[PDB]
Amino acid sequence: MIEPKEIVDPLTPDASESVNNILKQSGAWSGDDKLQKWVRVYLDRG
Amino acid sequence: LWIVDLNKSDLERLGTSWSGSITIGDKLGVSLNQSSISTLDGSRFIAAVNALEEKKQATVVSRPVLLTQENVPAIFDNNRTFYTKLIGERNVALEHVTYGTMIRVLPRFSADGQIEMSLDIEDGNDKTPQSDTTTSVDALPEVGRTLISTIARVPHGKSLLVGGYTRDANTDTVQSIPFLGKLPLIGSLFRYSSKNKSNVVRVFMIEPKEIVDPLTPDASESVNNILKQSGAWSGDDKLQKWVRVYLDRG
Amino acid sequence: LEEKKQATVVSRPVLLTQENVPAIFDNNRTFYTKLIGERNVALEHVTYGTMIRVLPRFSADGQIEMSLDIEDGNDKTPQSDTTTSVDALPEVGRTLISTIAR
Amino acid sequence: LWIVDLNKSDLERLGTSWSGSITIGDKLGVSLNQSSISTLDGSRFIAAVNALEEKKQATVVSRPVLLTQENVPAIFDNNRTFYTKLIGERNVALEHVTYGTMIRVLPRFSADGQIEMSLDIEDGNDKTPQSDTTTSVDALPEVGRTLISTIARVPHGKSLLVGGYTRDANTDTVQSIPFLGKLPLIGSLFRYSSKNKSNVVRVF
Amino acid sequence: IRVLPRFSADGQIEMSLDIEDGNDKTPQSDTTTSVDALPEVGRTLISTIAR
Amino acid sequence: TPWSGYLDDVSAKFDTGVDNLQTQVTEALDKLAAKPSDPALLAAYQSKLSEYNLYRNAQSNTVKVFKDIDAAIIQNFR
Amino acid sequence: TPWSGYLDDVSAKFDTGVDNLQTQVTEALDKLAAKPSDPALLAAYQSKLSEYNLYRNAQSNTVKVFKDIDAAIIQNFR
Amino acid sequence: ATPWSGYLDDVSAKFDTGVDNLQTQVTEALDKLAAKPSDPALLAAYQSKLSEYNLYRNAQSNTVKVFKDIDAAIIQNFR
Amino acid sequence: ATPWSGYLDDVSAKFDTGVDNLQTQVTEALDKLAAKPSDPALLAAYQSKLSEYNLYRNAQSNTVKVFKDIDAAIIQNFR
Amino acid sequence: TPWSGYLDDVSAKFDTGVDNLQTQVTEALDKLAAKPSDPALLAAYQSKLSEYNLYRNAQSNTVKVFKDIDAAIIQNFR
Amino acid sequence: TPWSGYLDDVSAKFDTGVDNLQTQVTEALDKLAAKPSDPALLAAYQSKLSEYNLYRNAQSNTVKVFKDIDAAIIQNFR
Amino acid sequence: ATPWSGYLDDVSAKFDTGVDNLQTQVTEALDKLAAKPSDPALLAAYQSKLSEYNLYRNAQSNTVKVFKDIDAAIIQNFR
Amino acid sequence: ATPWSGYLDDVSAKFDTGVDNLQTQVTEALDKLAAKPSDPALLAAYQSKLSEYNLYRNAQSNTVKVFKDIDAAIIQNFR
């Protein structure tokens, strides 16, 4: 069976939010690290 | 680009199988659920008992980043390998898996302040592992091999779902001996049962942004923190400074 | 001997495209199952995979028209060597469709 | 050009597995998870025990330098190898790994004093053909084989992050006997469990 | 069977016909039960017109 | 999965044909080691060791013969 | 109904020639495996395994020769 | 409807309608063999099928080339 | 990124994905046999595994060559 | 319905040659076992056992020699 | 008479050379099977069978050498 | 770095690292026994040691030869 | 001038530089075994080295001819 839909609006919540929630809830999160932050800042902050 | 993989599974197997044989008078042989000829001393039965239960949960997240100019095609490509090590650890047999990803893109700026992009994504685990024991599967998570090519346009700084996949399944099976499987007190001895449940979710989300300003702090100024914090720093050697001076700064 | 068996599988691929632009989606995956007995050394596996090609169109009626090619299934396997894996990993057919619908 | 790699790993395994066989006067024989009997009268079961914990971290930093003239394309190429001795040093060949890096570039000067460059970069550890000792991976850190091709322009003496990657993963598994794994005081004898956590970052 | 039918003005039917039929010549009959149980039928081919 | 070839399926026949000889030999030796001068035990062990010897010979000779039958056919593809 | 070529005919002549040998060798091997040392089983099996080896050799060499006689003619059409 | 086809195509296609199923038989024979690459009953079969396939293809191409050269040699005389 | 594979690659892969596990079984067999060479239970198994490996590799190579020569013969007639 | 080759024929010639020896040996052993200490029984068994041993040897060596001839002729087709 | 080639003539020279061996070797077997343990019989059969072996091998090898001479000449008519 | 070693080298060396100390134990026992040839406890030891050493060296050389043949058969097909 | 080297030279030399020292290992092991022809350790070593050397020289010489046959095939079409 096939079911198409038109898309007009982006995601809500943002990917950056949902992914962060999954990370923290799964304990996969690593941004707590004192060291990696020096680099991750460039990726998450810009 | 964000790529997310989540997996859960539960397994249980429990019960017995019976077979055997009897010889009477050395003149009549009787056998029970045997696909083979019998040695006719008889009075010989086997009950094979299995009982196991298991639960598994896995999660993987990956996010590549690539800088491009307008109208200029760009390519990013990266392989990586991971190893696991097993009891008897002195013995030379690491299990390993290789994951790899590539992205090819062509950006366009719309007058409306929207970014339009032509995309290829190719990603996944390599098809041909050589795991002989389960240890490698329980250690290192499988992911599919997935390929997408498409065009999409997203309002500035928002994000979008380009593709995704979900799979769900269940299975049940039961065996029993026709007369004994229903005995009131021992019927459970003559039954076998098994159940499987599986759920899988995989998704690809894209999120472009315009880059106007360079990095602050300076790259080198960050590196100098990392090196010291890690203790990797070795610029203290009176011997190396003689030349490091030319590289470290003007 | 008496035996009963039941199985159920559902898949739902999703793909983003634009009007008049052809698009492709393609995936396959391996599933593994531990196999008891034989000191539990044994393991079994199967591969499922799916591929989709599509061409969307917008009608003035607000209806959407699709040119579709779908190929899906489990890979054919003469190799089957045990009961419990055929009891634990479903079979599914090898199926091909090509058509137009609105 | 600055290349930086960071890697953290946490691993644990703990618990038990069971199997065996029983016989009753050569009347009946029973096997638990085993496909052949020991011809034994409820004796010589076998229990396999695992208990191990490990943590690991690795950090690598690399920086090439190349001088060029305006509008003149240039290439830089370096290849290098590293070795580790092993314990049980009576006779254990040296384990080794090879790192290699290549850069092609073409610099342009803007009127605004910005510099614009066409770049092609390729850096990595070469893939190990099939198998290696468990100790080598401990001593020599794995890094990817990465390839980037792009154009960038930067204000004078500033810096840009042209590409990067991060991977984060976690896994957990538990095996147990359907009724004994649920006993209040001894279930831990009939459960086996494992964990795996990984975090990786790479940037240019 | 391969056929092509033509309607007659008289309401008769005329057909160009090709037929072939039989057993494939792989003689398994090494053992008495084979021939006892399974009928041999000839291998035959016909091609003609009839109305 | 326990993938087995043709030669594997041949070899396995003997292992299932000699139902218990493998264990029997070990046990007969285990007891005889404790009392080497019992003739009732020596006579048992002589027979079990003979059976074992003949079994291992026949098995490896048959596997060797089927290897040559296969290799000869493969050679002719060219 | 399926298509079978000239080489298939040549090969098949051997299969329909040796009527039962394919089953004889299997059952003789199981009867041996049940008692790996019995002079009558050994003497039977040595014969059947030898006849099988010769059958498979003669078949494959013949088909090879015919393939080369054909290729040598096709080459001259050019 | 159907795509246009020339005389050389009719010739090439004759062989393919002649060997009704060889194209499939050659595939399935290979998958049986590769599943257990040590059974002489599978090997003797595959040897035959692969030989038949070889001769088939090789005869087809030579016939097409000879008919090409006959036509090119006639057309060379129109001028 | 992923390898381009031709047709011969597909043929070789049929064998590689045919013997699911032999590639590693052979190595494990060798490791334990070499650990205790004087055990006839180890020896009797290793002999079988090694023979199966030999036949597998041999058949794979011979097959590939035959397809190579069919293709080469067809290509030659283009001229 | 049997099927027999040439090596089968050669082998069977010895079996149809020695009319009864295979039963004779088994019954001589049968009675000897009841009274292992009797000289006439021992002297009879000593003969029969030897006749049997020589019979089985000459059988298997002949069948091998023929197999070795055929295998060398077929080799020359290719 | 049926058509016979040059290779047939060469082949037949051997058969007509060894006038009677073809049957002497069979009679010897029929006799030896009667009493497999007569050394006078064994000493004769060993000789006849050795002669037969050498005869068949010389025959086949000769035929093959002439086949390869002819094939080498026929190749150059082109 | 270490002297270059191929596949066959790495196969042969597996046996040597499998029989950890046999190479010494054989010479040790040989000297002890040569010291007092008429001692049954020494004879019963050396019989076992020498039998083990024989089986080991033999199986090593046979396996290396088989892995040479498997390769040569493949290399021949390149041409 | 520096000695001129072509593409076939390049391909050939890759093997020589790929086997770091085999080319001399096989000379030393010979001088040793020749000094003491009756030691099993020296024999077991030399068997391996000589096998590896034989396989190296075959794979080299076949690969060079395969390339030469492509170049010669392309150059024929310039006409």
PDB file of N, CA, C and O in Angstrom, chain I residues 26 30-31 33-35 37-38 46 50 53-54 57-58 61-62 65 68, chain L residues 11 14-15 18-19 52 55-56 59 63 66-67 70 73-74 77-79:
ATOM      1  N   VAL I  26      38.781 -23.052   8.575  1.00  0.00           N
ATOM      2  CA  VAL I  26      40.120 -23.558   8.270  1.00  0.00           C
ATOM      3  C   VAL I  26      41.162 -23.003   9.235  1.00  0.00           C
ATOM      4  O   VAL I  26      41.992 -23.744   9.777  1.00  0.00           O
ATOM      5  N   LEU I  30      43.443 -25.126  12.000  1.00  0.00           N
ATOM      6  CA  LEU I  30      44.897 -25.043  12.053  1.00  0.00           C
ATOM      7  C   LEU I  30      45.430 -24.613  13.409  1.00  0.00           C
ATOM      8  O   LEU I  30      46.374 -25.212  13.926  1.00  0.00           O
ATOM      9  N   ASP I  31      44.882 -23.546  13.980  1.00  0.00           N
ATOM     10  CA  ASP I  31      45.346 -23.091  15.291  1.00  0.00           C
ATOM     11  C   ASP I  31      45.339 -24.180  16.359  1.00  0.00           C
ATOM     12  O   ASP I  31      46.370 -24.459  16.987  1.00  0.00           O
ATOM     13  N   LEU I  33      45.025 -27.554  15.902  1.00  0.00           N
ATOM     14  CA  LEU I  33      45.861 -28.673  15.491  1.00  0.00           C
ATOM     15  C   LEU I  33      47.321 -28.371  15.781  1.00  0.00           C
ATOM     16  O   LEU I  33      48.038 -29.199  16.349  1.00  0.00           O
ATOM     17  N   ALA I  34      47.778 -27.182  15.407  1.00  0.00           N
ATOM     18  CA  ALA I  34      49.151 -26.793  15.688  1.00  0.00           C
ATOM     19  C   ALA I  34      49.407 -26.733  17.180  1.00  0.00           C
ATOM     20  O   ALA I  34      50.542 -26.936  17.620  1.00  0.00           O
ATOM     21  N   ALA I  35      48.380 -26.453  17.977  1.00  0.00           N
ATOM     22  CA  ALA I  35      48.595 -26.456  19.420  1.00  0.00           C
ATOM     23  C   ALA I  35      48.895 -27.860  19.929  1.00  0.00           C
ATOM     24  O   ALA I  35      49.742 -28.033  20.811  1.00  0.00           O
ATOM     25  N   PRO I  37      49.461 -31.162  17.845  1.00  0.00           N
ATOM     26  CA  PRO I  37      49.539 -31.973  16.619  1.00  0.00           C
ATOM     27  C   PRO I  37      49.297 -33.472  16.698  1.00  0.00           C
ATOM     28  O   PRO I  37      48.997 -34.073  15.666  1.00  0.00           O
ATOM     29  N   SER I  38      49.423 -34.106  17.856  1.00  0.00           N
ATOM     30  CA  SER I  38      49.375 -35.560  17.934  1.00  0.00           C
ATOM     31  C   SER I  38      47.989 -36.120  18.242  1.00  0.00           C
ATOM     32  O   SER I  38      47.887 -37.286  18.625  1.00  0.00           O
ATOM     33  N   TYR I  46      40.871 -31.520  10.407  1.00  0.00           N
ATOM     34  CA  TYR I  46      41.672 -30.629   9.582  1.00  0.00           C
ATOM     35  C   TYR I  46      41.880 -31.155   8.166  1.00  0.00           C
ATOM     36  O   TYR I  46      41.857 -30.377   7.206  1.00  0.00           O
ATOM     37  N   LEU I  50      40.849 -28.679   5.055  1.00  0.00           N
ATOM     38  CA  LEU I  50      41.842 -28.278   4.067  1.00  0.00           C
ATOM     39  C   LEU I  50      41.489 -28.752   2.661  1.00  0.00           C
ATOM     40  O   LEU I  50      41.647 -28.001   1.689  1.00  0.00           O
ATOM     41  N   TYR I  53      38.776 -26.559   1.229  1.00  0.00           N
ATOM     42  CA  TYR I  53      39.343 -25.272   0.833  1.00  0.00           C
ATOM     43  C   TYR I  53      40.055 -25.341  -0.509  1.00  0.00           C
ATOM     44  O   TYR I  53      39.884 -24.459  -1.367  1.00  0.00           O
ATOM     45  N   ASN I  54      40.853 -26.379  -0.709  1.00  0.00           N
ATOM     46  CA  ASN I  54      41.545 -26.539  -1.980  1.00  0.00           C
ATOM     47  C   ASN I  54      40.576 -26.583  -3.153  1.00  0.00           C
ATOM     48  O   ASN I  54      40.717 -25.825  -4.126  1.00  0.00           O
ATOM     49  N   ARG I  57      38.846 -22.973  -3.856  1.00  0.00           N
ATOM     50  CA  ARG I  57      39.706 -22.042  -4.592  1.00  0.00           C
ATOM     51  C   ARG I  57      39.930 -22.452  -6.047  1.00  0.00           C
ATOM     52  O   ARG I  57      39.860 -21.612  -6.966  1.00  0.00           O
ATOM     53  N   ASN I  58      40.121 -23.743  -6.292  1.00  0.00           N
ATOM     54  CA  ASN I  58      40.421 -24.180  -7.649  1.00  0.00           C
ATOM     55  C   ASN I  58      39.253 -23.946  -8.600  1.00  0.00           C
ATOM     56  O   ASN I  58      39.421 -23.377  -9.691  1.00  0.00           O
ATOM     57  N   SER I  61      38.762 -20.182  -9.557  1.00  0.00           N
ATOM     58  CA  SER I  61      39.658 -19.640 -10.574  1.00  0.00           C
ATOM     59  C   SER I  61      39.347 -20.157 -11.978  1.00  0.00           C
ATOM     60  O   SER I  61      39.190 -19.366 -12.932  1.00  0.00           O
ATOM     61  N   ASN I  62      39.311 -21.478 -12.146  1.00  0.00           N
ATOM     62  CA  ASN I  62      38.962 -22.022 -13.454  1.00  0.00           C
ATOM     63  C   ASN I  62      37.707 -21.400 -14.059  1.00  0.00           C
ATOM     64  O   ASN I  62      37.699 -21.056 -15.241  1.00  0.00           O
ATOM     65  N   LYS I  65      38.296 -17.762 -15.524  1.00  0.00           N
ATOM     66  CA  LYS I  65      38.992 -17.743 -16.817  1.00  0.00           C
ATOM     67  C   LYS I  65      38.084 -18.041 -18.014  1.00  0.00           C
ATOM     68  O   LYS I  65      38.197 -17.393 -19.065  1.00  0.00           O
ATOM     69  N   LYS I  68      36.189 -15.037 -18.988  1.00  0.00           N
ATOM     70  CA  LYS I  68      37.080 -14.094 -19.651  1.00  0.00           C
ATOM     71  C   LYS I  68      37.232 -14.410 -21.132  1.00  0.00           C
ATOM     72  O   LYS I  68      37.154 -13.512 -21.977  1.00  0.00           O
TER      73      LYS I  68
ATOM     74  N   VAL L  11      52.806 -19.458   8.204  1.00  0.00           N
ATOM     75  CA  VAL L  11      52.148 -20.725   8.506  1.00  0.00           C
ATOM     76  C   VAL L  11      53.106 -21.676   9.206  1.00  0.00           C
ATOM     77  O   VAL L  11      52.791 -22.247  10.252  1.00  0.00           O
ATOM     78  N   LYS L  14      53.758 -20.908  12.764  1.00  0.00           N
ATOM     79  CA  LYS L  14      52.678 -21.214  13.693  1.00  0.00           C
ATOM     80  C   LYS L  14      52.950 -22.498  14.467  1.00  0.00           C
ATOM     81  O   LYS L  14      52.735 -22.552  15.680  1.00  0.00           O
ATOM     82  N   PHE L  15      53.411 -23.547  13.790  1.00  0.00           N
ATOM     83  CA  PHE L  15      53.770 -24.783  14.485  1.00  0.00           C
ATOM     84  C   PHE L  15      54.847 -24.554  15.540  1.00  0.00           C
ATOM     85  O   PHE L  15      54.748 -25.062  16.662  1.00  0.00           O
ATOM     86  N   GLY L  18      53.488 -23.144  18.386  1.00  0.00           N
ATOM     87  CA  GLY L  18      52.542 -24.051  18.996  1.00  0.00           C
ATOM     88  C   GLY L  18      53.197 -25.008  19.968  1.00  0.00           C
ATOM     89  O   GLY L  18      52.751 -25.168  21.103  1.00  0.00           O
ATOM     90  N   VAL L  19      54.256 -25.665  19.509  1.00  0.00           N
ATOM     91  CA  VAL L  19      55.069 -26.548  20.377  1.00  0.00           C
ATOM     92  C   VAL L  19      56.092 -25.664  21.082  1.00  0.00           C
ATOM     93  O   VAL L  19      57.265 -25.577  20.720  1.00  0.00           O
ATOM     94  N   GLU L  52      56.747 -37.559  19.384  1.00  0.00           N
ATOM     95  CA  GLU L  52      56.109 -36.261  19.203  1.00  0.00           C
ATOM     96  C   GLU L  52      56.865 -35.407  18.194  1.00  0.00           C
ATOM     97  O   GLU L  52      56.267 -34.811  17.288  1.00  0.00           O
ATOM     98  N   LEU L  55      56.220 -36.642  14.493  1.00  0.00           N
ATOM     99  CA  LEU L  55      54.909 -36.251  13.981  1.00  0.00           C
ATOM    100  C   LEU L  55      54.823 -34.762  13.671  1.00  0.00           C
ATOM    101  O   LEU L  55      54.311 -34.359  12.618  1.00  0.00           O
ATOM    102  N   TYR L  56      55.342 -33.930  14.565  1.00  0.00           N
ATOM    103  CA  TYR L  56      55.340 -32.488  14.342  1.00  0.00           C
ATOM    104  C   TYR L  56      56.074 -32.071  13.071  1.00  0.00           C
ATOM    105  O   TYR L  56      55.488 -31.417  12.194  1.00  0.00           O
ATOM    106  N   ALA L  59      54.023 -33.329   9.799  1.00  0.00           N
ATOM    107  CA  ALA L  59      52.807 -32.595   9.464  1.00  0.00           C
ATOM    108  C   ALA L  59      53.091 -31.161   9.042  1.00  0.00           C
ATOM    109  O   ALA L  59      52.432 -30.636   8.130  1.00  0.00           O
ATOM    110  N   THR L  63      51.843 -29.688   5.248  1.00  0.00           N
ATOM    111  CA  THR L  63      50.922 -28.565   5.113  1.00  0.00           C
ATOM    112  C   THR L  63      51.514 -27.436   4.275  1.00  0.00           C
ATOM    113  O   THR L  63      50.818 -26.835   3.439  1.00  0.00           O
ATOM    114  N   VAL L  66      51.040 -28.298   0.592  1.00  0.00           N
ATOM    115  CA  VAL L  66      49.692 -28.114   0.059  1.00  0.00           C
ATOM    116  C   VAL L  66      49.408 -26.639  -0.200  1.00  0.00           C
ATOM    117  O   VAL L  66      48.835 -26.267  -1.240  1.00  0.00           O
ATOM    118  N   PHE L  67      49.783 -25.773   0.737  1.00  0.00           N
ATOM    119  CA  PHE L  67      49.596 -24.358   0.438  1.00  0.00           C
ATOM    120  C   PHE L  67      50.496 -23.826  -0.663  1.00  0.00           C
ATOM    121  O   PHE L  67      50.228 -22.729  -1.149  1.00  0.00           O
ATOM    122  N   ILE L  70      48.130 -24.825  -3.894  1.00  0.00           N
ATOM    123  CA  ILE L  70      46.936 -23.996  -4.047  1.00  0.00           C
ATOM    124  C   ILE L  70      47.265 -22.665  -4.711  1.00  0.00           C
ATOM    125  O   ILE L  70      46.478 -22.156  -5.514  1.00  0.00           O
ATOM    126  N   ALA L  73      48.401 -23.070  -8.652  1.00  0.00           N
ATOM    127  CA  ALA L  73      47.258 -23.279  -9.536  1.00  0.00           C
ATOM    128  C   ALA L  73      46.551 -21.980  -9.898  1.00  0.00           C
ATOM    129  O   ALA L  73      46.035 -21.853 -11.009  1.00  0.00           O
ATOM    130  N   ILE L  74      46.512 -21.012  -8.990  1.00  0.00           N
ATOM    131  CA  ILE L  74      45.863 -19.733  -9.273  1.00  0.00           C
ATOM    132  C   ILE L  74      46.733 -18.861 -10.156  1.00  0.00           C
ATOM    133  O   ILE L  74      46.275 -18.313 -11.160  1.00  0.00           O
ATOM    134  N   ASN L  77      46.610 -19.226 -13.961  1.00  0.00           N
ATOM    135  CA  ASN L  77      45.499 -18.662 -14.729  1.00  0.00           C
ATOM    136  C   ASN L  77      45.617 -17.177 -15.072  1.00  0.00           C
ATOM    137  O   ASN L  77      44.815 -16.706 -15.881  1.00  0.00           O
ATOM    138  N   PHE L  78      46.539 -16.409 -14.492  1.00  0.00           N
ATOM    139  CA  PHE L  78      46.609 -15.000 -14.877  1.00  0.00           C
ATOM    140  C   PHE L  78      46.787 -14.851 -16.373  1.00  0.00           C
ATOM    141  O   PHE L  78      46.102 -14.051 -17.014  1.00  0.00           O
ATOM    142  N   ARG L  79      47.687 -15.623 -16.949  1.00  0.00           N
ATOM    143  CA  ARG L  79      47.976 -15.506 -18.361  1.00  0.00           C
ATOM    144  C   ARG L  79      46.852 -16.086 -19.189  1.00  0.00           C
ATOM    145  O   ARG L  79      46.450 -17.224 -18.982  1.00  0.00           O
TER     146      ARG L  79
END
